Symmetry: C6
Subunit: 187 residues, 6 copies
């Protein structure tokens, strides 16, 4: 019950997060590297420490996740276009399209779960403003400073909450589908 409104809410949340990231994410991380001050005098002790502290920026991971999530929708649209171009057998084709969509949404749920787990394990919750690094160029351990940690961690928490809401909606959709539909999709 209430499946269509749930799908509508999920689409609204997807559009909301896509617009929010495409508007704000570029500006926050536009000059992250430039605003890096570290207590050191050895040349090259700054770039190595910045790479160690932030190997992959959060914006790249978010963009990658958003682009990867939309691929089943794109392939479904292409398959529907091909089916329309091609045209008792119609009912069989409709059933095949339905089971294809079911498998697509299951794969989308799996991808969302994997992306959420990876984001949780990689970045975490809070962004440390102060970092301690010791690589080959730096003779001893040095203390570097990060710029704007509060905004980064707040936006990361918001992204995690949005991903959790999407996961909950996807689980609700899977529960609406149910064991019989899962078994039918398997066979």
């Amino acid at each position: 019950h209430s499946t269509m409104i749930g799908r509508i809410l999920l689409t609204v949340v997807v559009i909301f997060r896509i617009l929010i990231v495409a508007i704000v994410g570029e500006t926050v991380y536009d000059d992250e590297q430039t605003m890096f001050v570290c207590n050191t005098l050895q040349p090259g002790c700054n770039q190595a420490c910045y790479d160690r502290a932030f190997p992959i920026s959060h914006i790249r991971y978010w963009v990658f996740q958003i682009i990867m999530v939309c691929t089943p929708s794109l392939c479904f649209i292409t398959y529907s276009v091909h089916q329309s171009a091609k045209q008792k057998s119609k009912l069989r084709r409709q059933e095949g399209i339905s089971r294809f969509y079911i498998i697509q949404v299951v794969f989308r749920n799996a991808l969302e779960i994997g992306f959420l787990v990876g984001q949780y394990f990689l970045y975490g919750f809070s962004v440390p403003g102060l970092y301690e690094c010791n690589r080959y160029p730096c003779i001893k351990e040095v203390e570097c400073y990060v710029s704007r940690p509060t905004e980064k961690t707040v936006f990361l928490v918001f992204m995690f909450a949005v991903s959790g809401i999407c996961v909950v909606l996807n689980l609700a959709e899977l529960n609406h589908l149910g064991w019989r539909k899962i078994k039918l999709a398997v066979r």
Copy 2:
């Protein structure tokens, strides 16, 4: 009475504020971090003080509020599209759409009130040109300077006035709806 003209005025104000922010807000806060001068010599005493003075910039909050306000309209549009795709029962569907729109506008009023309260409590009215900060990197209290405070506080006051006008229009719409419509929406 005069409900349609009030809704037209509200839409005009929304378009006005959206265009104004999308035109001017990026340029004002484009290089806020760069134009930061503080009386200190300790490395890292500038970024921490800037983060303390401005944890979240006003432009991010305004963009977030604008994007959040438009979500009920987007979900209503999607629901209308779904209803059109699906098509005595028509009258019942129209009544359901009407009560859905009523609940949507009530939620929009609540969200606007919450956003206005948060903006008032977080930023306030005036932006202090001079700041005094004392964090761990800075040994003692230091005096930092902010660039272009007058423009920031003027634009913040204008945004507050626009939000107040929108709140007044929303309250007028709720009064036009009235207790009977609220009770019907509840049940």
Copy 3:
């Protein structure tokens, strides 16, 4: 007489000024703050003096005026769309639309007059290349220098001339309307 050609000329002037500002204004004021040199050594004596000399930049005022001027046109378009969606009474509706447009153009003339008066009182005619400032951060009076004053004052004079031409055209339209139409709009 010659009312339609006057309105056409006014629209042409509006499009001309909008295109001119949207093309040139961003580049002139793109790096105004960076090109600021002042004879001082006290930290923070530059930002405060720049804020004192230029509290609100001319481009922001021009953009605000242009956006505010177009609001009656937008509300008229929305009202016309609503009237078209809704559809002896037709003649009454047409008369109401005509008087609404008359009131709208009167309000537009008033807004243009107010904006012109504010621009004249705030900025003036010439931009002083050399400024003398004495605020709290600066111990004594200091002499700061402004970059590209000639272009700024020339473009300000051109904007003032365009606003004057628009005001003259609006006054001509009001004279064409006349006392009888004003009295009819009042009642």
Copy 4:
């Protein structure tokens, strides 16, 4: 004779110059102020000398000329739209449109001549790489250096040649019109 092909060539040249300027002009003058080196030590001796050497940049004048030239075409299009909306009298209206277009093209030729004369008198042909300036901030005469003079003067010469070609085409069109058409337009 060969009037239509001449008008086609004029339109092609206008599109060519518009595309060329809109593509290249922004990049050449993007950082003209930054690449300014002058043999001086007095603060403020650089901005004043740059303003004296280049009061108005060539790109602003070219953009202003291009925008001003297109205004008669825009007003003619608006008048044609109004005439279409409004609809022996048709022949009179067509004759009025023809004489209006004749007056418009005469005004366009006059504006082009004035703009060409102003460009010739203001900028000239060659851009001096070395400048000598002596204003109030600079105690004595100082020698400043300009960046990329050859490209600026080459593009200025090309713009002058394009303007001359346009003037020649406009004069050919005026000769095709002739004394009888000029007299008819006058009365």
Copy 5:
């Protein structure tokens, strides 16, 4: 078997990689040259070492490969447009179009193989964070440092994996075509 779904998946992968690169590649390599620190004091020892370490950036090669891959599709579209404009002979024309498409896809597979081999031989897998260079401007061997190596090598590995998947799909399509179709295309 499963040829159409394979082509759909290949198109989806192409769109995915195109969007991913067009979104992320510009920002990563936006300021690669600026963030270059090398242990040297001789002027010109930095630019030569940067050129030696990175003669051609990865983004240029990826853009070139993507643009080159799409050329057979563009020429096929143009040929189809010409055939549509031009219109037992229809069957012969369809067979000619089919064999033209077969030759086009064979050429596309060859181009993809060549581009993959070139990318593997030129860049490799890992980006060395530390480089040792000795050119004419630098008296002796000097040690330069690269900024953000981990992101560059991760994205390069992802691009290599995407190219491998595309190559596998193209080989599957060629196997579906088969020896008989290859022989028919040859003659």
Copy 6:
């Protein structure tokens, strides 16, 4: 024979080169002036040497050539639009259009040959990474260094190869036309 496929290939090559330049050329030459290091201490010895080494950048010449090449196509399109608006005489008009197109393609071949000769004579093949300059501001001969020479010369070689391919295709088209068509176009 094979004229239509040759024209299709020429159009494909034109689109390919236009897309390639519009994508990559801006980024390569975005900050050429900034990354200029020369062994000198006299102020103004850098800008003059940079102007001497690179009077006109390659990107400007390429953009100018591309824009100039497309002008006959634009004028042909405008002439076709005029002919369509205007409408035994039809056959004569078609023959006139054909001979006009022949003259247009001959002029395009001549322009391409001239542009190729100019590019070969001006820039050459290789970009010298090291330059020796001696102008008035510099007391003696000084050694300046160029940034990213390998990419510039590689892209220049690619542009030369593309221009050569276009010239070969144009010569093939002219050979297909032949002496009889040339004589008919002359008279």
